[PDB]
Amino acid sequence: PPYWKTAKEMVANWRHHPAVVEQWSKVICALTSRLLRFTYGPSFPAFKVPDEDASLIPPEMDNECVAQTWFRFLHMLSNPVDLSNPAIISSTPKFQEQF
Amino acid sequence: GYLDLLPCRPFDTVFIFYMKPGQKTNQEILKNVESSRTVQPHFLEFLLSLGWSVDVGRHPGWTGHVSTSWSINCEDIGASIFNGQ
Amino acid sequence: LNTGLFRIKIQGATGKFNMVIPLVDGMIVSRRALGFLVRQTVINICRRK
Amino acid sequence: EAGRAEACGTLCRIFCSKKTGEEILPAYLSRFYMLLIQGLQINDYVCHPVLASVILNSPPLFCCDLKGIDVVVPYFISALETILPDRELSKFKSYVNPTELRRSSINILLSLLPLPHHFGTVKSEVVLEGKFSNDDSSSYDKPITFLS
Amino acid sequence: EPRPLPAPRRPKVNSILNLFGSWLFDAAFVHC
Amino acid sequence: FLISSWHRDTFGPDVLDKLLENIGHTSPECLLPSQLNLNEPSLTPCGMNYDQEKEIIEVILRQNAQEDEYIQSHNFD
């Protein structure tokens, strides 16, 4: 968990780069597709996902371990509402040093 | 007789079914109708607002089934009386 | 519904001339004009068929 | 505006998918009703993308027998008066397809016609928390009946 | 583009609101 | 036909939750910093104050009660 906390603290300072949110969206879509693939069953409609994004995650992960990493990656980025506020984004320690 | 049995105006037929939650088999759907006092009264009110009631034997016109139609020669059961017999 | 009004959904009533007017898909009708509208829709559908 | 529009795209769509006879926590309903009231404004606080998204995403909104949904009825009536009479919808043509928007508006309107004759003289509560009401009849502190 | 009917096995609306609606509500109202 | 003693007038009288609770019980660290709880509803949105929500909820309840009373009473009309 300390590494998770450090990553979450560090990743919050890179939200001004457009690639970060796109990669986070792709990875969370892949994780949630993998989760719902077994959470309900084959009866539930399957979430469409690109082949490469599904290939980012390896198939060795057991069913139990998927939920924890899915939740942790869903909350990995800060509240997306924060992106709406321009002052909050322009308040990182590097930005303050830049200020 | 062939000429007599030919009607002069178009005729149609309408079937009515009742559904309860958690029903997927045809037998249960047919079964829920024949019971009385087990359905909403609004269903009966809607039924009686479609048309009058005529006995199949004495009906001189279309009755929904060929074998008992155009016969010119004249305790609760629910909405199963209108089953066509 | 719980408010007394009725909700209507019709399946397989689309042909060359689109759909039938007297009772369109996703319509709301009060109890007063329910039987009359249902009968009119049946008549129109049979005539179209 | 794009993010705000997508926000109730998602929200507006979530509530319309409720199962029949399913209880919803009243706090969520209150928040959703407040969002709907805020979105449907025409006087000065009008935003075309969010209004179009709210109209388009929730056709069966009134048909899902939401508890207390009838409060926001006058706001929807006021909103529709500025879209249906329009000929080509120049303002909304750069955000959504005009034909689909017109279809959604027709679906919304057609789900409200029985309400007057069904209710008639029954009063409708008004929530006056500021300059939210669009009417200028100086009757804000008066429950409007469906006859008008 | 038509939208498919919701699956009969979908979770309750309150659970979806608990899981996601907070972000959705905040995002809607912040630009409101 | 008016059938006697037959008509309306005559007649008279979650797996997602399990997953969320399992994650919450097996991982207290990933919980929100007191802002949100998994099972419990989240806090009020930033755009609306608590008093406005308290007014809206009672307005909605009164609307529903009034409509139900009107529908039940005016049935015989």
Side-chain angles (χ1 to χ4, degrees):
Chain A
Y3 285 84
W4 292 98
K5 172 62 185 303
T6 305
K8 176 166 60 181
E9 175 60 35
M10 287 186 176
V11 72
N13 307 269
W14 315 323
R15 293 178 300 194
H16 53 277
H17 280 73
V20 181
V21 291
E22 300 176 0
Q23 278 287 341
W24 173 84
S25 176
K26 294 177 182 179
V27 175
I28 194 54
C29 286
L31 270 295
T32 191
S33 176
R34 187 65 177 273
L35 179 58
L36 64 91
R37 192 175 181 178
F38 73 98
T39 305
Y40 308 95
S43 61
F44 199 83
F47 188 25
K48 59 177 185 61
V49 61
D51 48 357
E52 43 181 357
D53 296 331
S55 71
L56 260 71
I57 55 179
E60 201 267 350
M61 307 182 58
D62 48 320
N63 296 20
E64 201 278 332
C65 190
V66 173
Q68 274 77 9
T69 181
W70 169 83
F71 191 87
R72 291 178 191 273
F73 191 83
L74 173 73
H75 280 279
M76 175 66 76
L77 184 61
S78 50
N79 309 73
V81 188
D82 290 16
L83 295 169
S84 63
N85 206 321
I88 295 302
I89 293 302
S90 57
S91 63
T92 73
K94 265 69 181 182
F95 280 154
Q96 298 277 16
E97 187 268 346
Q98 182 73 21
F99 179 79
Chain B
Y2 263 82
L3 182 56
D4 281 334
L5 287 186
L6 272 174
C8 52
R9 52 183 177 182
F11 65 102
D12 310 319
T13 311
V14 173
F15 302 104
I16 301 171
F17 306 98
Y18 198 102
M19 280 194 58
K20 280 188 171 62
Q23 289 180 342
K24 309 173 188 60
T25 57
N26 56 6
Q27 198 272 346
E28 187 71 14
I29 290 174
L30 298 188
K31 177 63 67 69
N32 68 9
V33 170
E34 64 89 20
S35 58
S36 60
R37 87 204 170 189
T38 56
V39 292
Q40 307 172 359
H42 288 281
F43 176 58
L44 275 79
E45 198 70 26
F46 164 73
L47 279 192
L48 270 300
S49 61
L50 288 176
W52 50 88
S53 176
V54 286
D55 303 6
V56 62
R58 320 291 87 86
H59 198 56
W62 178 251
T63 183
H65 192 272
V66 185
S67 73
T68 55
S69 58
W70 297 298
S71 178
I72 65 178
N73 303 89
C74 302
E75 182 180 1
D76 48 347
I77 317 297
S80 58
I81 300 188
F82 312 131
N83 61 335
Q85 65 181 355
Chain C
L1 303 180
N2 296 329
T3 59
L5 302 180
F6 291 84
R7 177 169 168 83
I8 315 299
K9 179 178 178 57
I10 304 186
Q11 296 177 345
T14 61
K16 176 58 185 60
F17 305 101
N18 208 17
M19 66 173 61
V20 293
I21 58 162
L23 185 64
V24 295
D25 191 10
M27 204 171 196
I28 298 184
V29 289
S30 57
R31 199 196 305 107
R32 301 159 183 79
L34 182 56
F36 164 75
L37 278 181
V38 161
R39 183 194 305 112
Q40 201 75 19
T41 313
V42 166
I43 289 179
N44 283 119
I45 286 180
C46 291
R47 286 181 183 177
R48 194 83 62 86
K49 190 169 181 300
Chain D
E1 285 293 335
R4 184 189 180 184
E6 288 289 334
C8 195
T10 316
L11 282 164
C12 292
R13 182 163 58 253
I14 279 179
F15 277 98
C16 299
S17 61
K18 59 164 297 182
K19 194 176 300 180
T20 183
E22 177 183 358
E23 296 293 332
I24 301 183
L25 298 184
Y28 293 142
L29 293 179
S30 61
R31 295 176 190 178
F32 185 59
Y33 297 156
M34 193 58 185
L35 171 59
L36 287 185
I37 294 177
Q38 291 286 156
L40 274 71
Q41 287 174 334
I42 303 95
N43 43 15
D44 187 68
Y45 309 97
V46 56
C47 300
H48 306 149
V50 62
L51 168 64
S53 180
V54 169
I55 285 183
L56 193 150
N57 283 276
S58 64
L61 174 62
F62 297 98
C63 312
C64 287
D65 59 277
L66 277 174
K67 179 179 299 181
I69 189 55
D70 298 315
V71 179
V72 75
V73 160
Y75 307 96
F76 266 94
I77 299 311
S78 57
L80 292 181
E81 299 171 19
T82 57
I83 178 170
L84 282 180
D86 297 6
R87 165 73 269 184
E88 76 286 339
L89 289 175
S90 60
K91 305 181 302 179
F92 296 89
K93 76 182 178 300
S94 59
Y95 299 87
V96 289
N97 182 265
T99 301
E100 183 62 33
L101 185 59
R102 198 71 69 95
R103 279 189 44 85
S104 302
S105 303
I106 291 301
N107 280 319
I108 285 302
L109 162 65
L110 178 140
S111 53
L112 297 171
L113 286 181
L115 274 301
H117 293 285
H118 190 49
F119 288 162
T121 179
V122 183
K123 304 295 181 180
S124 177
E125 282 83 2
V126 60
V127 284
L128 185 62
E129 291 79 21
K131 201 60 180 180
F132 297 154
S133 187
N134 307 269
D135 66 328
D136 208 337
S137 60
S138 70
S139 301
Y140 306 96
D141 50 329
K142 172 63 182 61
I144 299 300
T145 181
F146 303 98
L147 185 58
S148 181
Chain E
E1 189 73 20
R3 41 172 293 184
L5 298 178
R9 292 299 308 276
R10 63 184 180 276
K12 271 73 180 179
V13 59
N14 49 27
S15 62
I16 297 297
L17 264 295
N18 296 328
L19 197 53
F20 277 88
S22 64
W23 288 5
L24 305 166
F25 277 142
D26 294 329
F29 280 145
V30 68
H31 207 250
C32 172
Chain F
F1 187 79
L2 180 61
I3 318 291
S4 57
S5 70
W6 274 55
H7 286 281
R8 153 194 182 91
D9 45 2
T10 312
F11 281 164
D14 196 7
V15 293
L16 185 63
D17 180 72
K18 300 177 184 62
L19 179 138
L20 283 180
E21 67 90 15
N22 184 27
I23 287 187
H25 286 183
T26 54
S27 178
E29 187 269 342
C30 66
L31 269 297
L32 274 299
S34 70
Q35 164 61 32
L36 185 142
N37 189 270
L38 306 184
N39 262 306
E40 282 281 78
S42 174
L43 293 175
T44 182
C46 66
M48 291 322 138
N49 289 338
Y50 186 73
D51 52 357
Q52 286 183 357
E53 173 180 338
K54 285 298 298 179
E55 180 264 353
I56 291 291
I57 181 173
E58 58 90 13
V59 162
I60 291 310
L61 263 293
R62 182 162 54 94
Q63 177 61 256
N64 181 266
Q66 169 182 349
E67 283 193 350
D68 204 332
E69 169 65 28
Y70 161 73
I71 288 175
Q72 186 65 27
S73 62
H74 214 59
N75 179 33
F76 310 101
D77 187 18

